[PDB]
């Protein structure tokens, strides 16, 4: 009974996206003339009116614009990066979104955006399309599990991508008769590895990373 919408855009005008938000939400916006550009929106999930408003803010924030309520009237104004960025709405199925954000934030750049829609159990990711495909592959691997308890290893003399390539290669070469799928997430920006999986399995993988740190 509660209305669900699906926003899908490819290099559409920012002003058209605002007209669509105004059509959904019913809220009228006073767009500043300096507000310009092209937006790409991909809805892998249908969204409620409140969920659509949280999407709108995310798109606004990604392009450098802020919403101002000047005398009970809403106004989009520019505020204090690659050419064309895509905003995607991804449906997380088995994992509570709030738990997956921390794991996913290291993959989203400074210019990017990442927000949670817990009411819809969905993620709003603003990045370049090629990176979104990568983060989506991480979300997929994360989802199909039970626990999201992880260990963070700040690497002092080793290179994160070397350690990640080695730890996953030790993983793929072999694993026991028992199912204990572990995961390595490499944060190059800060030189650390996030280790995931069962608590017993993790502690082992943690020590393997420390031996490569030199």
């Amino acid at each position, epitope marked *: 009974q509660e*209305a*669900h*919408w*699906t*926003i*899908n*855009l*490819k290099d*559409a005008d920012i002003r058209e996206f605002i007209d*669509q938000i105004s*059509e*959904i939400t019913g809220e009228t916006f006073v767009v500043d003339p300096r507000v310009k550009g092209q937006v790409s929106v*991909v*809805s*892998k*999930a*249908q969204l409620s009116l409140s969920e659509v408003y949280q999407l709108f803010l995310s798109v606004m924030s990604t392009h450098g614009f802020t919403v101002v309520a000047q005398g009970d009237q809403a106004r989009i104004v520019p505020n204090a990066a690659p050419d064309r960025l895509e905003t995607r709405v991804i449906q997380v199925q088995q994992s509570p979104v709030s738990e997956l954000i921390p794991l996913i934030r290291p993959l989203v750049p400074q210019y990017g955006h990442l927000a949670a829609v817990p009411s819809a159990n969905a993620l709003i990711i603003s990045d370049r399309s090629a990176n979104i495909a990568r983060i989506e592959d991480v979300i997929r691997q994360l989802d199909q599990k039970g626990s999201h308890d992880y260990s963070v290893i700040n690497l002092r003399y080793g290179w994160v991508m070397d350690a990640a390539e080695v730890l996953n290669n030790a993983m793929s070469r072999g694993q026991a008769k028992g199912a204990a799928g572990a995961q390595v997430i490499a944060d190059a920006r800060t030189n650390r590895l996030i280790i995931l999986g069962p608590p017993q399995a993790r502690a082992k993988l943690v020590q393997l990373a420390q031996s490569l740190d030199t």
Partner: nanobody
Amino acid sequence: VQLVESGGGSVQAGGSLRLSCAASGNTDSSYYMGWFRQGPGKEREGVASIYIRAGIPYYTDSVKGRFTISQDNAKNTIYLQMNSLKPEDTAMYFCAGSVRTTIQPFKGNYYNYWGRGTQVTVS
């Protein structure tokens, strides 16, 4: 502009059917292609929707995990494989096209191009 439907029929509960929806005319200007079920004495309410450009499926909760909307852009057809069919699923199935980028996909008002129908009966 014109959609043809096939694949309907009479099946027992727990059964399955694959519906087809062929499109001819102005295909490029349609973003979505969905499935609506007009039961007798029941309101027109959509069940499955597909975003043609990226093949994005949207399903209503009642059919999710049981029904699957697919496409063949080469054969220009849409598919609805209905599984674990309940007797509630009995209705006249319609297939509609939407020329809009954004829309409530489970609401007919957002759809322009329409077809005749296919009777589905689950006993």
